[PDB]
């Protein structure tokens with residue numbers, strides 16, 4: 001729906017900075033990181049209003065097409081109709097997600113993927129920049 | 134280095150790509166188009182490849198077929214360095230802005246109104262991609 005990027009070969013130790021514009025009417029947006037569309041080490045989905053969630057961040061994994069156990073975050077530094085930046089650090093055991101306000105939290109790497117080769121965006125978000133750091 | 138689709142780049146926008154050119158570089162390329170078989174722009178600076186030495190080769194690809202090459206003298210590129218290129222387009226041409234200030238045009242052969250595919254490859258490592 002939004003950007004799909006493959007042929008990446010991000011490895012442990014490297015950082016992704018993603019800046020985007022959140023829609024005025026945003027309901028939800030997501031960032032998928034993984035091997036391919038069925039093997040996601042990280043599905044990051046801030047829900048403004050969707051699936052029954054309100055101002056909640058839902059994080060999950062996807063293994064061979066099937067979703068894992070959700071993990072919710074109540075930290076919610078996102079405003080509809082804004083331009084935000086999120087940074088994801090890929091470590092061996094887990095991922096660190098750094099929010100626009102500085103807040104950080106971790107998510108485990110349940111796949112035990114050694115690299116990130118796929119990135120996708122969806123929902124109510126317009127990718128503006130992707131950086132490798 | 135990267136294969137991207139659903140880019141939906143439109144006229145009026147500027148695509149900015151910044152990356153580092155390898156120490157022992159032979160070539161690097163940026164492809165823009167519909168898909169891998171249908172490119173409105175293959176931008177390939179060759180430090181030394183296919184017989185070409187310090188030359189910028191540009192072309193199109195229509196249904197898998199390369200089109201007529203266009204060669205540029207300007208070669209504001211040094212190996213081992215970090216470069217940035219800015220591409221914008223319209224119905225008739227693609228404008229490519231290089232480091233030295235340098236800039237040229239390339240015809241919009243397929244007359245695409247939106248660019249959905251971008252690939253980046255060769256002796257170049259992508260540091261950032263922006264849509265301004």
Ligand SMILES: CC(=O)N[C@@H]1[C@@H](O)[C@H](O[C@@H]2O[C@H](CO)[C@H](O)[C@H](O)[C@H]2O)[C@@H](CO)O[C@@H]1O
Pocket residue numbers: 043045051058059060067068070
């Ligand atoms: C509280 C609770 O259990 N809610 C869930 C939803 O989160 C879930 O929605 C799916 O969530 C996955 C992430 O795990 C993807 O975001 C997918 O897009 C969502 O639809 C649904 C269905 O799986 O189940 C409960 O409603």
Ligand SMILES: CC(=O)N[C@@H]1[C@@H](O)[C@H](O[C@@H]2O[C@H](CO)[C@H](O)[C@H](O)[C@H]2O)[C@@H](CO)O[C@@H]1O
Pocket residue numbers: 175177183190191192199200202
């Ligand atoms: C002088 C000359 O005509 N040389 C050409 C090549 O440049 C060309 O190589 C391909 O060129 C396309 C651009 O047209 C891409 O850069 C592709 O990667 C290159 O292989 C070849 C092959 O089509 O034809 C002549 O040699």
Ligand SMILES: [Cl-]
Pocket residue numbers: 038064
């Ligand atoms: Cl699979």
